[PDB]
């Protein structure tokens, strides 16, 4: 019971290798790798 490296999704990401069984949480998440706004957490 997670969330990742769990099922097969006709979206993936081949930058971070993430899955994404809905376009939309990708959609986000690509543009979630481009951000100029604030520095990581940590
Ligand atoms: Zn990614």
């Given at each position: 019971?997670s969330?990742?490296?769990?099922?097969?999704?006709?979206?993936?990401?081949?930058?971070?290798?993430?899955?994404?069984?809905?376009?939309?949480?990708?959609?986000?998440?690509?543009?979630?790798?481009?951000?100029?706004?604030?520095?990581?957490?940590?």
């Open positions: 019971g969330s990742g490296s769990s099922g097969e999704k006709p979206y993936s990401c081949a930058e971070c290798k993430e899955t994404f069984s809905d376009n939309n949480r990708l959609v986000q998440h690509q543009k979630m790798h481009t951000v100029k706004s604030g520095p990581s957490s940590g």
